[PDB]
Each structure stands twice: as structure tokens, then as C-alpha cells.
Amino acid sequence: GYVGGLPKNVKEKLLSLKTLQSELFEVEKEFQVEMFELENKFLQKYKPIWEQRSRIISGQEQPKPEQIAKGQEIVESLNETELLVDEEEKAQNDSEEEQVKGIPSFWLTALENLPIVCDTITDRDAEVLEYLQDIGLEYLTDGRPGFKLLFRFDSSANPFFTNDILCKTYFYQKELGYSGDFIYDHAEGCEISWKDNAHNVTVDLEMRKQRNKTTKQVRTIEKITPIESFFNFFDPPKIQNEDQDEELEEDLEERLALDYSIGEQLKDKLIPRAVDWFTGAAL
Amino acid sequence: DSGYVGGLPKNVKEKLLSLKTLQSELFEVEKEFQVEMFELENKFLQKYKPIWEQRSRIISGQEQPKPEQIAKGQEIVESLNETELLVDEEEKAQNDSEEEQVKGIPSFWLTALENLPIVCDTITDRDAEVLEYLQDIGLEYLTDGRPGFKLLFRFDSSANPFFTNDILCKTYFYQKELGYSGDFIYDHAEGCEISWKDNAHNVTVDLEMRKQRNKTTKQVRTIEKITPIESFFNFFDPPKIQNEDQDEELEEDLEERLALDYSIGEQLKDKLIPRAVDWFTGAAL
Amino acid sequence: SRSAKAGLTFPVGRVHRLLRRGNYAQRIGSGAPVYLTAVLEYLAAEILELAGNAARDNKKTRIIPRHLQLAIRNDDELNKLLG
Amino acid sequence: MDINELIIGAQSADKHTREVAETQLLQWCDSDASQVFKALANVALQHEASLESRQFALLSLRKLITMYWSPGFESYRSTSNVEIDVKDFIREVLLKLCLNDNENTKIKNGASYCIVQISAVDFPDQWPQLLTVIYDAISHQHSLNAMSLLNEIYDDVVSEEMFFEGGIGLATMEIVFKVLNTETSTLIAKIAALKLLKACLLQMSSHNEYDEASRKSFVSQCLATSLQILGQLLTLNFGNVDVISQLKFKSIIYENLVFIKNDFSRKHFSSELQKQFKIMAIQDLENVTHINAPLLETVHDCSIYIVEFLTSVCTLQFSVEEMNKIITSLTILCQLSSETREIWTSDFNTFVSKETGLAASYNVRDQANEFFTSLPNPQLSLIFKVVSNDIEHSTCNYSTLESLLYLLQCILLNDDEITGENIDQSLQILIKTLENILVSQEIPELILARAILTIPRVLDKFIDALPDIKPLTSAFLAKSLNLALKSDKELIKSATLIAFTYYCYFAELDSVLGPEVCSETQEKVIRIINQVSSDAEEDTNGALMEVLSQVISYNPKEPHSRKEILQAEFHLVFTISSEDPANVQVVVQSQECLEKLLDNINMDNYKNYIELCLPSFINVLDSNNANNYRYSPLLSLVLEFITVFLKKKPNDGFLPDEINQYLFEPLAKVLAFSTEDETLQLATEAFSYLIFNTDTRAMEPRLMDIMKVLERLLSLEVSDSAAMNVGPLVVAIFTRFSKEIQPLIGRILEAVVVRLIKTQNISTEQNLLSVLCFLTCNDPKQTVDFLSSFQIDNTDALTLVMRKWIEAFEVIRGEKRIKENIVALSNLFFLNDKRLQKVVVNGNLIPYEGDLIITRSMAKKMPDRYVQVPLYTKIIKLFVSELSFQSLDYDKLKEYIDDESVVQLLVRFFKEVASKDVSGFHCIYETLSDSERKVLSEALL
Amino acid sequence: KETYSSYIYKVLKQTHPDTGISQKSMSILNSFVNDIFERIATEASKLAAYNKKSTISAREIQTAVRLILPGELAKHAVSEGTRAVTKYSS
């Protein structure tokens, strides 16, 4: 206030300072571009490890003795002696071991140990997640900056939906959000092609066979009513703000906060850290 | 669940060990990522240096705005809401010989620091007295030697009556290994010994003077006392560890002081200097 | 400033500066300028009071030199001090 | 009608008729002043008679107005009061006469002065439309004399509220700027407008509240427009039509510029304007000096104002050409007019008074001195080079040469040390030029006097950077003294004496010259002083006393000394001071010369000194004896000289019996018969010293006369202001004749006490307390006994005496007197007498609420209220305050202590008390405030 | 001097709620104030010399006031000085 009331020398100096702010903002835009480039470069390195651990989890790849020894040394250094092998376990025959290819409920257990998302997990969702193989992440290069999340389900043996892969997208605002970071923009997701309503874990089903009392017609009814579930992560909030969605936009903003918290959780901790959280050591 | 963990077959335990090894490999990849982050951030600090120096010259009055930068500032003001900078007719009537009687922006850095939420709490008025002479706050990344970043505070010896040091700097250091989350983890910090002109102007201590002719020792003797006191300049000379005292007394010292010192340093480095002018005017809040 | 603490309107600093630059003595005590300023302000108050009385007797609200000289002349002590 | 006859009679020549007319006029007013005022107004307005008749009618109105117009005038006479209806009539007539430009100047001036008086008494409550009418005249009728009247009355009537807020200030500035901008305005109109502008600037220079936004904006606008206009005015030229009007016009312009520069903040009158007006001012110096070809007087006044401006903006850089212009112009302006040359040459006392700086006249010479005294060092050095070069060329043009030497003298008086690249060569050449001027046989007198006065300045300013300064100083001083001797002009002699005074300031002549040549020059200066002393005015005698004080200082302090020089020195000290004893400077410097002439003294020298001096004094005392010793400046002077001798006793014994034989009886008569305050004061002081310092056995036979004089002085037959020094006389009598006087101590002590309590004079109470201090040091318990037994107004004198004594302690003067009081009070404290313990005195003042200044008017209802403390507590507080001027528990301090100067006395006193007077000091220490305790304990460390 | 005038205005406003003073009267008052200042200061210098003391202090000022100011002016000037110094240094 009084700084403006000061003679025009101070005002002109501050105007020059604002011009330097604009120049620094351009430099910071190029800075964010370089950070995104190098983040993509190192995400290309992240992806192979994540895919390899997904293969181990779902059982289409096997460990090696050297990896087992290195993990043994790492666990011994970590003090997490619960993973250590015992002679009683060694007594298990190969036939008993091979009864299950992948780790039973690996992703399900990791998400259950998860602070927030475990709350959204229902029993039917827990049954579903046994068919979840891999979780993938990607960066949006075109248009608005952002990141994309992917899940892989063994649709062949999945009796719930035919979606081989489901992808969730996030967006950021066009310019630089203040403080040098990006602020969220509305998110979009795919739709699950449920095989039937009974197997739809996002819906509770009611079956009715009726003879109409008014028209005396004969009909069989299949009824649908949405319910909350882990797949409510998909069908995300529609739009950031629109005229026709305001009443919806209230819940859209609330669920946007919740979903961005969940997605930031996933990106930062779960996908980069999955072993400990399946084992719970990261708690 | 320990029972479940025991329930896992030996083969699944081997698979989990392999997965943990993969996680460690990801940790090394994160180490390389952080190295590249640090290198490119140092490059962009070099890129920022010219603009920061120019705005520092403007703040100190060593340089005067040019009409082109003035017009750019005006059109930026037309954007958003900064009409405070729009020069009125009354001010144009003034003459440079009337305005230049005060050179620079008074208490620019003091105001910017006092507006910063966490740090301003530690600045006492006695410390703020020195901050009046603060004219520059610079960043330096410890690319050489141990990793870390160094904060620089500049003064004029011929102006300030407190110390003869033109530049006071604070240093922060990280460990050789990354944190669990992948972010950097800290190592013990260090600060410079302020070259106070005299103990009276020293701001981190309180002194007393008495003369006795002590009967108990039959000594015509003079005694002096010094007591450390809370002050922002305690931000320097950070705590250090001595094993036997470290276990008992300094454990809480590291629990408390290091957290506050590290938070203050991070807040400065990130929030303040990149938005120094906005923090000065409060747009950065 | 010191004048406010003393309870004076006159410029204790100006008086102290005049005393020092006059080289009246090797040193000027801390209380000397305060005392001298109080005395000068008292004398100004006396002269102004009597000049204001002189003006008010004429039913004016302005102390022109005529009133000031009349007040000084008609007051024996001020007459002796100031002629 | 009969007023005209009285005007004739009063205006006539002969006393008898003028007195008759004056009376007749006065009784008419004493009966009724309505008739007289109405008649005089009609006389001025209507008769159209001889201008002198109307002028005298207006003059009579002037005289009658103060007597009869209103009680507001001191000269008011209550015989009758002017009728209200007539008052309006004469107001109207005066306005019609004064505002009409066509009236003769004498009529207009008379009417104007009458209006000034009437307005001073009547505006605004009685005469509302004065300013309305004046401004209507100025605006519509363009009455120039109306502008002059407004200028004269402006400050008397136009208060701040009207000026800034009533619109009078804006209206006046509108008038001024309309007059000045109007190209067709005659120079007289512009001059009147500029004077009115000066009035407005004065009003704007200071006001009750500077911060008021409206006032601040108005002032800024007025100053900006004024500076613009003045910038335009100076650019005008009038083609030599009227040089006197042009000179007055330039003068007032530069007066206004100086006012704006000096009385308003630097934010007004920016530096670029200062440069522009500097260039204009230099060009105007050139123009004025050429116009010089009452013309001279107006030229000089205009020059005073131009040079005052240049002095105000002297901080700016001056180009070489600007310095050359300024120096040439000041060379022309500063040369002495023929009238001043004749006045100085015919009466050298005027020259001495001016050169010594005592003369009141202020002219272009003094303003030029101001200009050069204010220059900064770079400009100062450059202008010194310019002036020196001009002197080098003008060495054969005598008319300018003095002017150049005076300019050089002004430059060398500047504090900044002249320094430069080529100044050393210039200084060598200048020294040679001055030597040639002294040696030149045909040089005029005033140029020679200026060279003699200037040479000391040259040597002083370059005390450094001159090799062989000592030979130069010796040669120049010897040459100047030789010229002063064997020349018949008192200008040269007085100038040489003043030049000697200048030499003594920078050179230690005895060291520089050596003892031998120092003695020789003392003899030469004494001869010159003798020669000039025969034709000395008061100021000249003051200057001669200063010179002689300087000469005496250099007389040899060696055991060998030229008795002739000492004798001549004293002879001059007494002769010069005897000529005009009333001159304050002569008296003071005569005391200086006598003291330092008796600085160090021994018996054998003293006996000769007294043998010469004293017989002269007895002549004066006997001379005034016929005059019964009424006041005489010479009498007081000789009394002071006798006191100086008696004070400067030789250390090697008591005074000679001759001094007793010489002085006692004359002083005895002076104290027995004199009646005036100053004479008795001085006689008492001298007589007290005579009694004190004479050998006791040599004076005891005189004891009877001593007591007779004392009893005369004590009786109060001499007023209290007289007999001021009786205290010291009683002290001396007690000291010399302690045993013989014992029976009389009671009466003398009681009379001294009676004098002490009633007196309000600081010196009288100090002197009288000296007696009590003596008695208390001699025997405190006896003094307490006398004071307690003695009664005044049914109260023991002790309570009154102690209260006076304590209050007097604050202001007693002198080192020895302070020490005497301290020891006396210490003895009273140690005595620990119950009679004293019950005494109560006044402590600090109790301040009232607020910050109201208490004037004598308020005293009746806001008296000085004190707090009451026992005597001993106040003694200790006084001593602690004294310690504080000079420079934490009693039990620990007492234990701390266990394990000739003022501070020495006080510290030893406190240590002794704390060690011994355990209970009395313990309680007092317990009640002292912490700051007092800290000063006390710090001193005791 | 120009400061003296402003403080003369303040003292006047305290003395009388509302009354004005002409510029020439203000100059006259400033002349009187400067005259008194000079006289008291020179007297204090002489007294400090006579007291053989290097410092002009409240003692010298009080004595000079008592010597110069006639009658009740001396008493009230002394009272004002003492009370001003007591408010000060406290």
C-alpha cells in the first residue's frame, strides 16, 4: 500500500521487478518443460522394473537364484526377518508350491495395507482384485500436461468384465500454477464393460419376474442400482466446472479431492513401492 | 499379518526377495534421477542468476528502470490486479533529485523475510536491526564436495555497525544416500562464525559487567559474563554432537533444532527467493 | 527526542548544539541544555502571555509589535531584562 | 471656523505663537475632540489651500490621533473621546486622500501614516471595510499609492487565517502577478508589486501548521509562479531610460530571490533555477558596474543584494570566466568612495572603528567579505589564483589596488586551507609584490595601510607551505613598525598596531623573533602607542588596550627584564584608561593588562611598582574626596586597580607598611563618607584585602578605625545593595584580630545574620554566608549556640539561617568558596547536635499535573511546593549531587570500606561518616534513592 | 531561529487557546530569545572558568539565571529549569 504511495521511483522500480517476474516465469516454464522431459526419460527406466515385478506377481516369470540371494541380503540388512526362509517351508514339495503361479492377492494385500484406498475396498472388490495383474503409469505429452494410470486384468479368466486394460487420465492447468507447481485439472476415465449386472461389483442386482397388475402382461425384469466400489475410481468426476453440472459439481469437487489424493498416493508410493506395502513393512 | 507371512510358500518368499531386490534397483535408479535433478537445477540456478542480480540492483538503487521495462511492468500490472504500481499524475510532478534522496527499496529483504510464515517467528527486533543492512540473498548449490545448498546473506561493512563480514552464509548438507520416499535426507548443518565488531553489538549473546574487590579470595578483580540468547542469528552455528552427551542430551536437540532449521532452510530456498518481490509485497502468500 | 521527555516544546537538541559549537566550555553537561531550554521557553511564555493580555485589552486577537512593546514596557521586570 | 488660525500659529516660527496655538488646539480637544477632528479633516479635504497648510493639518491629526483616538494608545488622554460619527468621517477622508494617486506626495504620505495608526488600533473590529476599499482601489482604479499603503499595512492587519483561508493571500498574489506579467506596467508599478510580493513571501515563510495540505499546495504554486516570473523579469532591459528605477527594480528582485532561497525548503527553488539565476546575477554585476559610469548609493545597495544572492548560491561551481567577471565587478564596487577616503584620512578613529569591526555601517565591502568567507575549497583556491593574478597586473593602478588587496584579505579570512597546483609560485610572487608595496616610497596612504594589514593574513594562511617563514615574519614586522614610526599619518600608525595584533595571533613572537628582537619590538610598539594615544576615540582606546595587553604578554619572564619597558607599560595602562574610564572595553582590558603585568611578582619589584602606581591613586581618591566620593567612573576604576594590587600580593611576604600607610586612610574615608553602592562595594573589597594581607603586628593600632568602618557598614545606614562585601571584611577582621574582637562577635554575628535572611541578592547572601562558614570551621558548636539563642520574629535564627544556607549552597561560586562551604557543612554534620536534628528544610519540588508553564500570573494559584526533609539528609543529598557533577547496601558498603580537591573532600567525608557516624548515615543511606546510592558507592570504590 | 518561531507558535497556542502573532513580532521574540541565550551562555562560561571546572552544567546555568534574570523572573526560571531537569533524567 504505502509502497505505492511512495514517490514514483519506487513504483517504477517495482514495475521493473514485475517485468523481471515475467521473464523469470518464462524461464520457469522452460524449466518445467525440462523437468518433464527428464521425468519421462527416467520413467522409461522405471517401466521395465515395474513390468518385471508385475510378471513376478502374476506368475508368468520366475525369480533367479542370484536375485533370491540379493533379496536375502537386503532383507537381512533391513531387519525384516519375517521374509526369511525356514526348513519347514523348504520341506514343501514342488507340486505343493506350483499349485499357485502368482502371489495370491498380492495387489489386493498391497492396497489393503494402503492407508486410504483400503477403505474403498469391498469384499466383492477384493475378489475382483485377485484378477488384477499389473498397475502401469504414463505421462501425457500432448496438450495439457498430466499423467495416466493403467491397470491390467486377466480378462480371459475374469468373470466380471471384458476390459483387458483400464486407463485413468489426469490433467493439469494450461499455465504454471503459483509456487512453481501445477494445480489439478479435471480427470477422465474409461467405462467397464461388465459381463452382467450380477457380476458387476459397481452395482447391486435385483431379479424380478412379474405379471403386471394393470396391463396383465408377462415380463422378466433385470434391475440396476449403482454402489460404491474400488472401480468408482473409474467413471471419475465429469468436468472441472460447467453450467449444467453445478449441483453435480459439488460432489465432483469433493470426489476430485479424494481421487487426486488417491492418484498422488498411487504414483508417489504404491507403484514405486509395492513389495514393502504388500508385506506391510512400509507401514 | 505374521501368520499370513509364515503361510507364504517358500517359492513365494523367494519371489518376494527378488521383488525386494527389484525395489533396491529402483532405489539406485532414483539416486541417478536425483543426481540429474540436481545437475539441471544447478544449471537453471545459473540461468536465474542474471535476473536475480538485476532485481537486486533495482532493490539497492544501483540501477534505474528503463522505459521499456517500465511499459512491460505496466502491462503486467494491467493483468490480474497490481494497480498499486500505476504511477499517478502527482508522482510525475516530482523530480529525481527529490526521490533519489532515498536510494533503493528500504527494508526490502527484511520485509520479505518477516512476511515468510515459519522464518519470521525467529527474527527478533535485535536481529531485524542487522536485516536493515541486508541487500542481497543468494543461493549456491554445493555441487563440489558434500551435496547441499548454501544460503548467502550480504551486508556492507562500512555501513553496518555490527560485524565486519560483508557476506554471512548458511550451509545445509544431505546424506550420501537418498531417503525412503526417494527425496533427499539431511546431514548435520554448519554455520559461519560472525565477525562481530564488538561483543556489545553481538546479537546472539547477553553480557554483564561487575567489579568486586572480592573478600572471599582477596582479589581486586573484574568479571565478565556471556549468555547465549534466542535470536534469528542463532540460525547459524547449528548444533553439533558429542557422543556421550549426544546419546542423552543432544538426541532431543537433533529431534527439535534440526527439524526447525531444515524446514526454515527449505522454506527460504523454495518459497522466498524465487518469489522474492511477491513475498515483499505479499502477493506470494 | 529528549525535549519530549523533559516536557518542553523548545528544541533541546538545537540548544545543545548551540552550546557545544559556541565553545563556551570544554564540555556541556547533559542537564545544561535541558535547563537552558526550559528557561528560554519560560521567558517566551511570559512575554507571550503579557503581549496576549495587551492585545486582548484592545479586543484584538493578534499580537502585532505595538502590543509586544507595550507589554514589555509596562512590565518592570521584563523592562529591566530587555530594556 | 477658527482651526486654520491655530494651524498657522502652530506652523509659524516663533515659540510664543506656536505654543499658544498648540495649547489652544489641546484645550479644544480637552473640551471636545469631535470639533477639532472634524475641523482638521475638513481642512485637509476641502480648503485646497497651500499644500503646507494641508500637510500641517494632517500632521496635527497624526499627533491628535494618538492622544485622543482610543485608550489603546499609551499616550491616550482621558479628557474627551472622539465622537464615533467623526471617527468614520476622518477614516473616509483619509482613504479618499491616500488612495487618489493625483494628490501630492506629501499629502498622500501624511494620510498614509495616519491610516497606519488608525488601522493598527481599529482593524478589524472597528473598521471592517479597510481591505475591501484598498483592494477595490488597486484592482479597479489601479491606484499605485494604494499598493504602497497595502504593503505598509499588510503584516499589521492580514492574519494567517485571512491570508491562506480567507482568500486575501490569493487575491494579493493575483494582483501581484497581474501587475508583473502586464508588459505595459511602468517600472514604478512593478517595483510596488515586487515589494508587495516580498510581503506575501514573508507571510508564507512560516505559519502555524506547515502540514496543512491546502496551505502547502498554495505555497508551492505561489513559489513556482514567482520564480518563473522573476526569471522573466531579469531578462528585461530598458535601454538606459531611467537607471535609478532600474537599480531599485533589480535590487528588489534579488532581495526576493534571496528570501526564497534562504527561507524556504530546498525542494522549492531547484538547483537548475539556482544555476540560471547565478548566471543572471553575474551578468547583473557587470551591468551595474557599467551603469555606475544618488546613483552611486543605489548602485551599492543593488550590489549588496546581488552579492548576497551569489553568497547564497556560492556552493555551485563557478566557471573561470564567471570568477573573472565576479572579481572585476567586486574590484570596481569595493573601491572606497572619495567621501570615505576623506573621512578616514581626516579622522583616523573612524578607520580604526571600521577596521576593528566595531562600526555599525554595513556596505558592499562587508557583503563581499561574506561572499569570500563562504566559498568552498576548490572555488576558493581558484579565486585566490584569480585575485593574485589581478594584483600582479594592477601593481601600478593605485585606485584598484586597494580594492584588490581588500578582496585578498577577505579570501585569506576563509577557513578552508587554500591549496592548489601552482599556488606556491603565485604566493612567492605575491610576497614579492607586498614587499615592493611596503618599500615603495610614493605609495598612497590607504593602499599602504591595507598592505600592512594584509601581510599578516598572507603569512598566517600559509604558515605551512612557506619556507623560511621565520625570516619573512621578522622582516615584515620590522618593516611595518619602521614605517609606522617616522611617518606623520595616524592611519599608518593605527594600521601597524592592528597588524601587530594580527601577528600575535598566529606567531609566538618571542620564540619567532628571539628575546632580543622581541624586546626591541616591544619598545617600538610602546613608542607607537604613545604617539597615537593623543588622538584616541573610545573605540581607538579599546583597540590600544588590546594591543598593549598583547605587548605586555611578551615582556621577558627571565629574571632580567628592562625596567624601562615595565615602567612605560604601566604608564600607558594608566594614562589610556584614565582618559575614558567609562569605556567598558578599556576597563576590562586595563584589568587584564594590570593582572598580567603583575602575573608573577616578588617583593623588590613590587616595592617599585607600588611606589609608582599607588601615589597616583591616592591623588584620585583625594580628588574625589572633595566630591564627597559621589560616584565617578575614574573613582571606581582606581578602586579596582587598588584591589588588583592588593590581590596580587608578592608571595615572599606580607604587604609593605607603606601600602598600609598609603591606602588605609584614603579607603577609611571612602568607607566612612561615600554613599553610592558601587563605590562602597569596591572600597569594602579593597579594604578587606588590605586588612587581610597586611602583617598583623603592623596593623593592630589601626584596629579602632577598622571597627568604626565596620560599624558604619553594619548599621544599614548604607543600603543592602551597598555593603555587599561586608562579609569578607568581617572574615578578615576575625582572622587578623581573632583575640581582640571576641567581645564583639555576638553583635557582629547577629547583624550579619539579620542581613543574610532578608537579602535576596545572590552575591550578598553568598558573602554573608562566608562569615558563618568561617565561624563554623573555627568552632561549630559556638556558632550553633549563637544562632539558636538569637531570635527573629519569635523563631530561632537557626531554622531560618540553615534553610537559607542549604538553598544558597546550590549556587555558591568559586572553588575555594565551595570547599569552605563543604567543610563548614561537614563540621555541622559531624557535630550531630540535637538542635540541628530538629531543623527541617526544603527538598525537591513537587511537580504539578500536565505540562503547563507556570508564569508569574499563575504563581498565585500554582505556588512552588517543596517536600520537607531533616537538615542532615539534605546535607548528604547536596554532597551526592556535587559528586554527580564532578564525576549497594550500607552494611556491605560499611564492610567494603573496612576491607584538597572537591572530590577528595567529599569522598573522605563519606568514608569517615560511614565508618564512624554509623546510625545517622545508616538511616539516611537506607532512604537515599538508588541512583544516589550508586553514585555514592561508585565514588567510594 | 525558524525552529524557534514554530515553538513560539506552540507556546502561544498553549498560553492562549487562539491568538495570532505577526511576523515582525515573531522576529522580535526571536531576537529576545537569542539575546537571553547569548547572555546566559557567556555567563555560564565565565562561571565554569571561575569554578575551575571544565564542564558547563546545571550549576552554572542556575547561577547565571539567578544573576541575570531580575526579580521573580529568576525564581520562576529556576523553578522551570529544575522541574524540567527532574522530569528529564528520570
Residue numbers in the entry:
A (entry chain E): 83 to 365
B (entry chain D): 81 to 365
C (entry chain B): 17 to 99
D (entry chain A): 1 to 293, 302 to 895, 931 to 942, 963 to 1004
E (entry chain C): 37 to 126
Article passage:
The importin Kap114 transports H2A-H2B into the yeast nucleus, where RanGTP facilitates histone release. H2A and H2B contain disordered N- and C-terminal tails and central alpha helices that fold together into the globular H2A-H2B histone-fold domain, with very basic surfaces that bind DNA in the nucleosome. These same surfaces are shielded when H2A-H2B binds the Sc Nap1 dimer (Nap12), which is mostly localized to the yeast cytoplasm where it chaperones newly synthesized and folded H2A-H2B. The mode of H2A-H2B recognition by Kap114/IMP9 is well understood: the superhelical Kap114 wraps around the H2A-H2B histone-fold domain, occluding the histone’s DNA-binding surfaces and functioning as a histone chaperone. Here, biochemical and structural analyses show that Kap114, H2A-H2B, and a Nap1 dimer (Nap12) associate in the absence and presence of RanGTP to form equimolar complexes.
For comparison, we also performed cryo-EM analysis with a mixture of Kap114, Nap12, and excess H2A-H2B without RanGTP, which produced a heterogenous mixture of particles that included unliganded Nap12, the binary Kap114•H2A-H2B complex, and small populations of two different assemblies containing Kap114, Nap12, and H2A-H2B. Excess histone in the sample had destabilized the Kap114/Nap12/H2A-H2B ternary complex (more discussion in Fig. S1).
